[PDB]
Amino acid sequence: KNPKSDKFKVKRFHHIEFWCGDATNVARRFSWGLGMRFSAKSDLSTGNMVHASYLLTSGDLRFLFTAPYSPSLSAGEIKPTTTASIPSFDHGSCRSFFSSHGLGVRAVAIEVEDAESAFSISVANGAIPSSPPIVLNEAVTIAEVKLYGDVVLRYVSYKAFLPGFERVEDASSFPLDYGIRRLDHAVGNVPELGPALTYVAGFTGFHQFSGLNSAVLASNDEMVLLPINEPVHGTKRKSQIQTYLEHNEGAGLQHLALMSEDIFRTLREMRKRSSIGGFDFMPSPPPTYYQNLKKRVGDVLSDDQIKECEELGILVDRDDQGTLLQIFTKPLGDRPTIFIEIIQRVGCMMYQSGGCGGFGKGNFSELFKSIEEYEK
Amino acid sequence: KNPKSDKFKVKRFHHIEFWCGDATNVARRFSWGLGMRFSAKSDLSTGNMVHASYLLTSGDLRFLFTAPYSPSLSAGEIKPTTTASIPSFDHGSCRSFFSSHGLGVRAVAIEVEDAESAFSISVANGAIPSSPPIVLNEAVTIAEVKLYGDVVLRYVSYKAFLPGFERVEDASSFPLDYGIRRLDHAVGNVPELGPALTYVAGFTGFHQFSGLNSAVLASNDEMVLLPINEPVHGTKRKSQIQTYLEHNEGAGLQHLALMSEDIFRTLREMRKRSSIGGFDFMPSPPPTYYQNLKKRVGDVLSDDQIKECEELGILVDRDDQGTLLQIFTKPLGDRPTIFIEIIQRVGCMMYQSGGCGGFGKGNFSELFKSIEEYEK
Ligand SMILES: CCCOc1nc2c(C)c(C(=O)C3=C(O)CCCC3=O)ccc2n(C)c1=O
Ligand SMILES: CCCOc1nc2c(C)c(C(=O)C3=C(O)CCCC3=O)ccc2n(C)c1=O
Ligand SMILES: [Co+2]
Ligand SMILES: [Co+2]
């Protein structure tokens, strides 16, 4: 059931912003590893004396990488006179975030009908304010509230990327594309699920859609999906959620799930590049798992299509309404914290409805069971 | 003339260590951009709870990328019980370096006959101690003295990479190679050249080999070359050296010159990758400059060879004894601070003697003059 209880009008995921120590090297790594094009910049060359911000795009997916310059470059500035293109940016908050957590997501940004009203309604409904609504060039409004840990939910609304950003010139934007098209969901880890759910669901009106307890929060059309995990203690293998919290110094964003229009092509392109600057993938399931695939999704995937999943290490799950293919990268940076999921959903055609096929929770049982059989 | 006045026995450049915020993303970018293989690691997987260090190699060139983990992971440790593989590492110094300067070189490491004696003699001769000699696994000795700004000169000596580092497994080490073979020289920028020269020459015994004043310090066989620049003020175009100091928050390493066994192949491979994760190059000189090449180095480079320089944007200079080909990357990171030079030297065969052909100071005049002609 879906009560459609959003307290303000939400459209779609807009962008994800990483807070980095050096935005250049992270953006170039990600661009090559994921096949995203350099689309926009705000930095010294565009008159920004405060922060370096570089935007990568693939389809509707927008990754923003931001790092601070020396505060000395903007010491004369005040907020009314700032050359920063993102008014919420603060040297101290950025350095403190990155020092405490390492490389990771600062902002999950959603496009809303009216960022000012979204901020007002959120805070009136218990959201902790982070950056008040600011109108950029009489064209765009941006506001931020706290989401979990040091991650903010960022609202952007447009009258008609951001003012102050420049479109990068052609020689600098090579048209990489491995098939990734949009952000499917963004998942946080917290020490206690209950209070985090009540806080976020409380100010948004989003409704509810081993080693972990989890629940998914969703907007009215369920195209904005924000799962949250908590650890399950006392268990045999130490909870991966608890390991995240220890190495991240507390709550934060665990994984971004990126939808591909062709997960076979995406994974072929990404795996070709894993050892030459790209991203590594988690270990593949045993051949047991892909033998059992015929019995699970035989009417969905060809024998050749299922063999392709096994070559690429793709996981497949299925619920009442649809089928999802999925795979997970190793952590994106030094710490075992944030990672990426590549996903493609089959079914639920009306457009495809958000969340079609679930989030892969059935693959816990299939993996354990397939692992048991391989040992034989 | 060469007085051969080294106060201790120096062999060769050993490695360059970058202090990063995230060593993973910088190392992967550099590996792809420069064609260096992943050779060794010290991190959580090898029992290092303190820092992540990843070593890239190309020929004899060794690039080390290091970042701190959360101090919380090693809070119980003391220096006698540390799991760090580099005993000079300190969470606070690393965070402070990176926060103040951004991505850059912390250590220029040279291999010496006896790091303990090198440290003792250096400090006895005015060097500012940074990390005392420490013997690793009864096999390697490491010590550090201050060089300029927050950059240290690191001494390593071997009895027979470092203890505590693991050789990376084969699936993780793709054998990239674009022809780079060793570090030719490493250059610092300081506000005042005189006192920096007197300090470094004072404790090493190294001898002396627009917009800047510069001088090169050299070991006995002149295979360790450490130039130092200072700005020239009052001039028309603002000094690039002064711009470095402003954006770097003071003195530090300006550029690493990497010798290639085939600069044509290196530059073809690097330029192919500039816009897909690699490094960008400075703007090429006008076709004027390459027309004048025939009159300058005609007896050295074929017409086809000189046309190849023009396709790749290679600079060529020549002194009494040899010829050098050279080109400069744009800055390696967000700030206009550190960059890389690719170099190949022709001549001075006895082996090739260090510094053959100079450092390209003649190309200032040729560029200005060639620029004047292009405007015509
Ligand atoms: C071992 C089972 C399959 O392998 C894995 N699957 C994972 C999945 C399926 C997710 C995930 O995407 C997800 C949930 O699990 C529910 C909340 C919404 C959501 O996005 C996250 C991490 C996973 N890890 C680490 C695995 O090792
Ligand atoms: C404009 C003239 C050629 O273009 C350039 N040449 C450069 C050279 C030749 C060097 C350099 O390598 C060097 C010296 O100049 C003397 C001290 C030892 C040394 O290593 C450094 C920077 C340069 N930049 C920025 C240029 O734009
Ligand atoms: Co997921
Ligand atoms: Co040079």
CSV table of N, CA and C in Angstrom, one decimal, chain A residues 5-144:
chain,number,residue,atom,x,y,z
A,5,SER,N,1.8,10.2,1.1
A,5,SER,CA,1.7,11.1,2.2
A,5,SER,C,2.9,12.2,2.2
A,6,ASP,N,3.5,12.3,1.0
A,6,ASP,CA,4.6,13.3,0.9
A,6,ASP,C,4.1,14.7,1.4
A,7,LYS,N,4.9,15.3,2.3
A,7,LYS,CA,4.5,16.6,2.8
A,7,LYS,C,4.8,17.8,1.8
A,8,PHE,N,5.6,17.5,0.8
A,8,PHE,CA,5.8,18.5,-0.3
A,8,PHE,C,6.0,17.7,-1.6
A,9,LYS,N,6.0,18.5,-2.7
A,9,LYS,CA,6.1,17.9,-4.0
A,9,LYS,C,7.5,17.5,-4.4
A,10,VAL,N,7.8,16.3,-4.5
A,10,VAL,CA,9.2,15.8,-4.8
A,10,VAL,C,9.1,15.2,-6.3
A,11,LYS,N,10.1,15.5,-7.1
A,11,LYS,CA,10.2,15.0,-8.4
A,11,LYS,C,11.2,13.8,-8.4
A,12,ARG,N,12.5,14.0,-8.6
A,12,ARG,CA,13.4,13.0,-8.8
A,12,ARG,C,14.7,13.2,-8.2
A,13,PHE,N,15.5,12.2,-8.0
A,13,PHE,CA,16.9,12.4,-7.6
A,13,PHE,C,17.6,13.4,-8.6
A,14,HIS,N,18.3,14.3,-8.0
A,14,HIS,CA,18.9,15.3,-8.9
A,14,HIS,C,20.4,15.1,-9.0
A,15,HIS,N,21.2,15.0,-7.9
A,15,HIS,CA,22.6,14.7,-7.9
A,15,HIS,C,23.1,14.2,-6.6
A,16,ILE,N,24.3,13.7,-6.6
A,16,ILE,CA,25.0,13.2,-5.4
A,16,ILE,C,26.3,14.0,-5.3
A,17,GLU,N,26.5,14.6,-4.2
A,17,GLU,CA,27.8,15.4,-4.0
A,17,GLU,C,28.7,14.7,-3.1
A,18,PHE,N,29.9,14.4,-3.6
A,18,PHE,CA,31.0,13.9,-2.8
A,18,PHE,C,31.9,15.0,-2.2
A,19,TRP,N,32.2,14.9,-0.9
A,19,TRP,CA,33.2,15.8,-0.4
A,19,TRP,C,34.5,15.1,-0.3
A,20,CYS,N,35.5,15.7,-1.0
A,20,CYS,CA,36.8,15.1,-1.3
A,20,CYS,C,37.9,15.9,-0.7
A,21,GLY,N,39.1,15.4,-0.7
A,21,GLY,CA,40.2,16.2,-0.4
A,21,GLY,C,40.8,16.8,-1.6
A,22,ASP,N,40.8,16.1,-2.7
A,22,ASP,CA,41.1,16.6,-4.0
A,22,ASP,C,40.1,16.1,-5.0
A,23,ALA,N,39.2,17.1,-5.4
A,23,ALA,CA,38.1,16.8,-6.3
A,23,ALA,C,38.6,16.3,-7.7
A,24,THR,N,39.8,16.8,-8.2
A,24,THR,CA,40.3,16.5,-9.5
A,24,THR,C,40.5,15.0,-9.6
A,25,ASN,N,41.3,14.4,-8.7
A,25,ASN,CA,41.7,13.0,-8.9
A,25,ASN,C,40.5,12.0,-8.6
A,26,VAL,N,39.6,12.4,-7.7
A,26,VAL,CA,38.5,11.5,-7.5
A,26,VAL,C,37.6,11.6,-8.8
A,27,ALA,N,37.3,12.8,-9.3
A,27,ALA,CA,36.5,12.9,-10.5
A,27,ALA,C,37.0,12.2,-11.7
A,28,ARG,N,38.4,12.3,-11.9
A,28,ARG,CA,38.9,11.6,-13.0
A,28,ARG,C,38.9,10.1,-12.9
A,29,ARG,N,39.2,9.6,-11.7
A,29,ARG,CA,39.0,8.1,-11.4
A,29,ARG,C,37.6,7.7,-11.7
A,30,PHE,N,36.6,8.4,-11.1
A,30,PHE,CA,35.2,8.0,-11.3
A,30,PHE,C,34.8,8.0,-12.7
A,31,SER,N,35.2,9.1,-13.4
A,31,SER,CA,34.8,9.3,-14.8
A,31,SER,C,35.2,8.1,-15.7
A,32,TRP,N,36.5,7.7,-15.5
A,32,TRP,CA,37.0,6.5,-16.2
A,32,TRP,C,36.4,5.2,-15.7
A,33,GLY,N,36.2,5.1,-14.4
A,33,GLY,CA,35.7,3.8,-13.9
A,33,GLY,C,34.3,3.5,-14.2
A,34,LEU,N,33.5,4.6,-14.3
A,34,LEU,CA,32.0,4.5,-14.4
A,34,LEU,C,31.5,4.9,-15.8
A,35,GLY,N,32.4,5.5,-16.6
A,35,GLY,CA,31.9,6.0,-17.9
A,35,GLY,C,31.0,7.2,-17.8
A,36,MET,N,31.4,8.2,-17.0
A,36,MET,CA,30.6,9.4,-16.9
A,36,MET,C,31.4,10.5,-17.5
A,37,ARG,N,30.7,11.4,-18.2
A,37,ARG,CA,31.3,12.5,-18.9
A,37,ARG,C,31.5,13.7,-18.0
A,38,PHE,N,32.6,14.5,-18.2
A,38,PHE,CA,32.8,15.8,-17.5
A,38,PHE,C,31.9,16.8,-18.1
A,39,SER,N,30.9,17.3,-17.4
A,39,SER,CA,29.9,18.1,-17.9
A,39,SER,C,29.9,19.6,-17.4
A,40,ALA,N,30.2,19.9,-16.2
A,40,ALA,CA,30.3,21.2,-15.7
A,40,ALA,C,31.3,21.4,-14.6
A,41,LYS,N,31.8,22.6,-14.4
A,41,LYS,CA,32.8,22.9,-13.4
A,41,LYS,C,32.5,24.3,-12.7
A,42,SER,N,33.0,24.4,-11.5
A,42,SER,CA,33.0,25.6,-10.8
A,42,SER,C,34.3,25.6,-10.0
A,43,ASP,N,35.3,26.4,-10.4
A,43,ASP,CA,36.6,26.4,-9.7
A,43,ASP,C,37.3,27.7,-10.0
A,44,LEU,N,38.6,27.8,-9.8
A,44,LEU,CA,39.4,29.0,-10.0
A,44,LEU,C,39.1,29.6,-11.4
A,45,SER,N,39.0,28.7,-12.4
A,45,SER,CA,38.9,29.1,-13.8
A,45,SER,C,37.6,29.8,-14.0
A,46,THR,N,36.6,29.5,-13.2
A,46,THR,CA,35.3,30.2,-13.3
A,46,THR,C,35.1,31.3,-12.3
A,47,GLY,N,36.1,31.7,-11.6
A,47,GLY,CA,36.0,32.7,-10.6
A,47,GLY,C,35.6,32.3,-9.2
A,48,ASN,N,35.6,31.0,-8.9
A,48,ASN,CA,35.3,30.4,-7.6
A,48,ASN,C,36.6,30.3,-6.8
A,49,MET,N,36.8,31.2,-5.8
A,49,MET,CA,37.9,31.2,-5.0
A,49,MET,C,37.8,30.3,-3.7
A,50,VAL,N,36.7,29.6,-3.6
A,50,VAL,CA,36.3,29.0,-2.4
A,50,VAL,C,36.4,27.5,-2.5
A,51,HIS,N,35.8,26.9,-3.5
A,51,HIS,CA,35.8,25.4,-3.6
A,51,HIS,C,36.0,25.0,-5.1
A,52,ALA,N,36.5,23.8,-5.3
A,52,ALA,CA,36.6,23.2,-6.6
A,52,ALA,C,35.5,22.2,-6.7
A,53,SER,N,34.6,22.3,-7.7
A,53,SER,CA,33.5,21.4,-7.9
A,53,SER,C,33.4,21.0,-9.4
A,54,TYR,N,33.4,19.7,-9.6
A,54,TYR,CA,33.4,19.1,-10.9
A,54,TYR,C,32.2,18.2,-11.1
A,55,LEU,N,31.4,18.3,-12.1
A,55,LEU,CA,30.2,17.5,-12.3
A,55,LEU,C,30.4,16.5,-13.3
A,56,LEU,N,30.2,15.2,-13.0
A,56,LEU,CA,30.1,14.2,-14.0
A,56,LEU,C,28.7,13.8,-14.3
A,57,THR,N,28.4,13.4,-15.5
A,57,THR,CA,27.0,13.0,-15.9
A,57,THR,C,27.0,11.7,-16.6
A,58,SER,N,26.1,10.8,-16.4
A,58,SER,CA,25.8,9.7,-17.3
A,58,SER,C,24.3,9.5,-17.3
A,59,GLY,N,23.7,9.8,-18.4
A,59,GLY,CA,22.2,9.8,-18.5
A,59,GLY,C,21.7,10.9,-17.6
A,60,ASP,N,20.8,10.5,-16.7
A,60,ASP,CA,20.3,11.5,-15.7
A,60,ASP,C,21.1,11.5,-14.4
A,61,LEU,N,22.1,10.6,-14.3
A,61,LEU,CA,23.0,10.5,-13.1
A,61,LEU,C,23.9,11.7,-13.1
A,62,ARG,N,23.9,12.4,-11.9
A,62,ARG,CA,24.8,13.5,-11.8
A,62,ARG,C,25.7,13.3,-10.5
A,63,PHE,N,27.0,13.2,-10.7
A,63,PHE,CA,27.9,13.1,-9.6
A,63,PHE,C,28.7,14.4,-9.5
A,64,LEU,N,28.7,15.0,-8.3
A,64,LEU,CA,29.4,16.2,-8.1
A,64,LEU,C,30.6,15.9,-7.1
A,65,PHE,N,31.8,16.4,-7.4
A,65,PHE,CA,32.9,16.2,-6.6
A,65,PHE,C,33.4,17.5,-6.2
A,66,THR,N,33.5,17.8,-4.9
A,66,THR,CA,33.9,19.1,-4.3
A,66,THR,C,35.0,19.0,-3.3
A,67,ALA,N,35.9,19.9,-3.3
A,67,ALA,CA,37.0,20.0,-2.4
A,67,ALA,C,37.3,21.5,-2.1
A,68,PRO,N,37.8,21.8,-0.9
A,68,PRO,CA,38.1,23.2,-0.6
A,68,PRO,C,39.4,23.7,-1.1
A,69,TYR,N,39.5,24.9,-1.5
A,69,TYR,CA,40.8,25.6,-1.7
A,69,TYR,C,41.3,26.1,-0.4
A,70,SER,N,42.5,26.7,-0.4
A,70,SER,CA,43.0,27.3,0.8
A,70,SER,C,42.0,28.5,1.2
A,71,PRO,N,41.6,28.5,2.5
A,71,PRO,CA,40.8,29.6,2.9
A,71,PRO,C,41.4,31.0,2.6
A,72,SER,N,42.8,31.0,2.6
A,72,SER,CA,43.5,32.3,2.3
A,72,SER,C,43.0,32.9,1.0
A,73,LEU,N,42.6,32.1,0.0
A,73,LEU,CA,42.2,32.7,-1.2
A,73,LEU,C,41.0,33.6,-1.1
A,74,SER,N,40.1,33.3,-0.1
A,74,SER,CA,38.8,34.0,0.0
A,74,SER,C,38.7,34.6,1.3
A,75,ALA,N,39.8,35.0,2.0
A,75,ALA,CA,39.8,35.5,3.3
A,75,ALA,C,39.0,36.8,3.4
A,76,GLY,N,39.1,37.6,2.4
A,76,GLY,CA,38.4,38.9,2.4
A,76,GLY,C,36.9,38.8,2.2
A,77,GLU,N,36.4,37.6,1.7
A,77,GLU,CA,35.0,37.5,1.4
A,77,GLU,C,34.1,37.3,2.6
A,78,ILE,N,32.9,37.8,2.5
A,78,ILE,CA,31.8,37.4,3.4
A,78,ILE,C,30.7,36.7,2.6
A,79,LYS,N,29.8,36.0,3.3
A,79,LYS,CA,28.8,35.3,2.7
A,79,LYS,C,28.0,36.1,1.7
A,80,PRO,N,27.7,37.4,1.9
A,80,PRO,CA,27.1,38.2,0.9
A,80,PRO,C,28.0,38.5,-0.3
A,81,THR,N,29.3,38.4,-0.2
A,81,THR,CA,30.2,38.6,-1.3
A,81,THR,C,30.9,37.3,-1.8
A,82,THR,N,30.4,36.2,-1.4
A,82,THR,CA,31.1,34.9,-1.7
A,82,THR,C,31.2,34.7,-3.2
A,83,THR,N,32.4,34.1,-3.6
A,83,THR,CA,32.5,33.5,-5.0
A,83,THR,C,32.2,32.1,-5.0
A,84,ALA,N,31.8,31.4,-3.9
A,84,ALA,CA,31.4,30.1,-3.9
A,84,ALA,C,30.1,29.9,-4.8
A,85,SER,N,30.0,28.8,-5.6
A,85,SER,CA,28.8,28.6,-6.3
A,85,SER,C,27.8,27.8,-5.5
A,86,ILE,N,28.2,27.1,-4.5
A,86,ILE,CA,27.3,26.4,-3.6
A,86,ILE,C,27.3,27.1,-2.3
A,87,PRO,N,26.3,27.9,-2.0
A,87,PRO,CA,26.3,28.7,-0.8
A,87,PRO,C,26.4,28.0,0.5
A,88,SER,N,25.9,26.7,0.6
A,88,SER,CA,26.1,25.9,1.8
A,88,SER,C,27.5,25.5,2.0
A,89,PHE,N,28.4,25.6,1.1
A,89,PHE,CA,29.8,25.1,1.3
A,89,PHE,C,30.4,25.9,2.4
A,90,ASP,N,31.2,25.2,3.2
A,90,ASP,CA,32.0,25.8,4.3
A,90,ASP,C,33.3,25.1,4.4
A,91,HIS,N,34.4,25.9,4.4
A,91,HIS,CA,35.8,25.3,4.5
A,91,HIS,C,35.8,24.3,5.7
A,92,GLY,N,35.4,24.8,6.9
A,92,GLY,CA,35.6,24.0,8.1
A,92,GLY,C,34.8,22.7,8.1
A,93,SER,N,33.5,22.8,7.7
A,93,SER,CA,32.6,21.6,7.6
A,93,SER,C,33.2,20.6,6.6
A,94,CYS,N,33.7,21.1,5.5
A,94,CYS,CA,34.3,20.1,4.5
A,94,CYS,C,35.5,19.4,5.0
A,95,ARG,N,36.5,20.2,5.5
A,95,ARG,CA,37.7,19.6,6.1
A,95,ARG,C,37.3,18.6,7.2
A,96,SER,N,36.4,19.0,8.1
A,96,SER,CA,36.0,18.2,9.2
A,96,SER,C,35.3,16.9,8.7
A,97,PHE,N,34.3,17.0,7.8
A,97,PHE,CA,33.7,15.8,7.2
A,97,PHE,C,34.8,14.9,6.7
A,98,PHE,N,35.7,15.4,5.8
A,98,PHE,CA,36.6,14.5,5.1
A,98,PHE,C,37.6,13.9,6.1
A,99,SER,N,38.1,14.7,7.0
A,99,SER,CA,39.0,14.2,8.0
A,99,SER,C,38.4,13.1,8.9
A,100,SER,N,37.1,13.2,9.2
A,100,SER,CA,36.4,12.3,10.1
A,100,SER,C,36.0,11.0,9.3
A,101,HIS,N,35.5,11.2,8.1
A,101,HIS,CA,34.9,10.0,7.4
A,101,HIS,C,35.7,9.6,6.2
A,102,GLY,N,36.6,10.3,5.7
A,102,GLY,CA,37.2,10.0,4.4
A,102,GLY,C,36.3,10.3,3.3
A,103,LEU,N,36.6,9.8,2.1
A,103,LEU,CA,35.8,10.1,0.9
A,103,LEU,C,34.4,9.6,1.0
A,104,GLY,N,33.4,10.5,0.8
A,104,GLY,CA,32.1,10.0,0.9
A,104,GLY,C,31.1,11.1,0.5
A,105,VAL,N,29.8,10.7,0.6
A,105,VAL,CA,28.7,11.5,0.1
A,105,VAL,C,28.3,12.5,1.2
A,106,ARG,N,28.4,13.8,0.9
A,106,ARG,CA,27.9,14.8,1.8
A,106,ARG,C,26.4,15.1,1.5
A,107,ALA,N,25.9,15.1,0.3
A,107,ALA,CA,24.6,15.6,0.0
A,107,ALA,C,23.9,14.6,-1.0
A,108,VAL,N,22.7,14.1,-0.6
A,108,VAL,CA,21.8,13.5,-1.5
A,108,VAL,C,20.8,14.6,-1.9
A,109,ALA,N,20.8,15.0,-3.2
A,109,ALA,CA,20.0,16.1,-3.6
A,109,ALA,C,18.8,15.5,-4.5
A,110,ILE,N,17.6,16.0,-4.1
A,110,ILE,CA,16.4,15.7,-4.8
A,110,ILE,C,15.8,17.0,-5.4
A,111,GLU,N,15.3,16.9,-6.6
A,111,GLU,CA,14.6,18.0,-7.2
A,111,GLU,C,13.2,18.1,-6.6
A,112,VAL,N,12.8,19.3,-6.2
A,112,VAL,CA,11.5,19.5,-5.6
A,112,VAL,C,10.8,20.6,-6.4
A,113,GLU,N,9.5,20.7,-6.1
A,113,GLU,CA,8.7,21.8,-6.8
A,113,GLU,C,9.2,23.2,-6.3
A,114,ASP,N,9.4,23.3,-5.0
A,114,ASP,CA,9.7,24.6,-4.4
A,114,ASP,C,10.7,24.3,-3.2
A,115,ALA,N,12.0,24.5,-3.4
A,115,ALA,CA,12.9,24.2,-2.3
A,115,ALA,C,12.7,25.0,-1.0
A,116,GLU,N,12.2,26.2,-1.2
A,116,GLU,CA,11.9,27.0,0.0
A,116,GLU,C,10.8,26.4,0.8
A,117,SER,N,9.7,26.1,0.1
A,117,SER,CA,8.5,25.4,0.8
A,117,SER,C,8.9,24.1,1.3
A,118,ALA,N,9.7,23.3,0.6
A,118,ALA,CA,10.2,22.0,1.0
A,118,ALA,C,11.0,22.2,2.3
A,119,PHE,N,11.9,23.2,2.4
A,119,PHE,CA,12.7,23.4,3.6
A,119,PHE,C,11.8,23.8,4.8
A,120,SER,N,10.9,24.8,4.6
A,120,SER,CA,10.0,25.3,5.6
A,120,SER,C,9.2,24.1,6.1
A,121,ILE,N,8.5,23.3,5.3
A,121,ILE,CA,7.7,22.2,5.7
A,121,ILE,C,8.5,21.2,6.4
A,122,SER,N,9.7,20.9,5.9
A,122,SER,CA,10.5,19.9,6.6
A,122,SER,C,10.9,20.3,8.0
A,123,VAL,N,11.4,21.5,8.2
A,123,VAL,CA,11.8,22.0,9.5
A,123,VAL,C,10.6,22.1,10.4
A,124,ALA,N,9.5,22.6,9.9
A,124,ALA,CA,8.2,22.6,10.7
A,124,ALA,C,7.8,21.2,11.1
A,125,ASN,N,8.3,20.2,10.4
A,125,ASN,CA,8.0,18.8,10.8
A,125,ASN,C,9.2,18.0,11.3
A,126,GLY,N,10.1,18.8,12.0
A,126,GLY,CA,11.1,18.1,12.8
A,126,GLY,C,12.5,18.0,12.1
A,127,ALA,N,12.6,18.3,10.9
A,127,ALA,CA,13.9,18.3,10.2
A,127,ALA,C,14.9,19.2,10.9
A,128,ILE,N,16.2,18.8,11.0
A,128,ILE,CA,17.2,19.7,11.6
A,128,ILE,C,17.7,20.5,10.5
A,129,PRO,N,17.6,21.9,10.5
A,129,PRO,CA,18.1,22.7,9.4
A,129,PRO,C,19.6,22.6,9.2
A,130,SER,N,20.0,22.6,8.0
A,130,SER,CA,21.5,22.7,7.8
A,130,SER,C,21.9,23.9,7.0
A,131,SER,N,21.2,24.2,5.9
A,131,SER,CA,21.5,25.4,5.2
A,131,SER,C,20.1,26.0,4.7
A,132,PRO,N,19.9,27.3,5.0
A,132,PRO,CA,18.5,27.8,4.7
A,132,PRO,C,18.4,28.0,3.2
A,133,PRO,N,17.2,28.2,2.7
A,133,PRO,CA,17.0,28.4,1.2
A,133,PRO,C,17.7,29.6,0.7
A,134,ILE,N,18.4,29.4,-0.4
A,134,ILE,CA,19.1,30.5,-1.0
A,134,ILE,C,18.8,30.5,-2.5
A,135,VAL,N,18.4,31.6,-3.0
A,135,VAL,CA,18.1,31.7,-4.5
A,135,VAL,C,19.3,32.1,-5.2
A,136,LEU,N,19.7,31.3,-6.2
A,136,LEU,CA,20.8,31.6,-7.0
A,136,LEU,C,20.4,32.2,-8.4
A,137,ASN,N,20.9,33.4,-8.6
A,137,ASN,CA,20.7,34.1,-9.9
A,137,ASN,C,19.2,34.2,-10.3
A,138,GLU,N,18.4,34.4,-9.3
A,138,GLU,CA,16.9,34.5,-9.5
A,138,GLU,C,16.4,33.3,-10.3
A,139,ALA,N,17.1,32.2,-10.3
A,139,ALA,CA,16.8,31.0,-11.2
A,139,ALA,C,16.6,29.7,-10.4
A,140,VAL,N,17.4,29.5,-9.4
A,140,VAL,CA,17.5,28.2,-8.7
A,140,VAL,C,17.5,28.4,-7.2
A,141,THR,N,16.7,27.6,-6.5
A,141,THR,CA,16.7,27.7,-5.0
A,141,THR,C,17.2,26.4,-4.4
A,142,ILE,N,18.1,26.5,-3.5
A,142,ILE,CA,18.8,25.4,-2.8
A,142,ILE,C,18.7,25.5,-1.3
A,143,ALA,N,18.4,24.4,-0.7
A,143,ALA,CA,18.3,24.3,0.8
A,143,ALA,C,18.7,22.9,1.3
A,144,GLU,N,19.1,22.9,2.5
A,144,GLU,CA,19.6,21.6,3.0
A,144,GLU,C,19.2,21.3,4.5
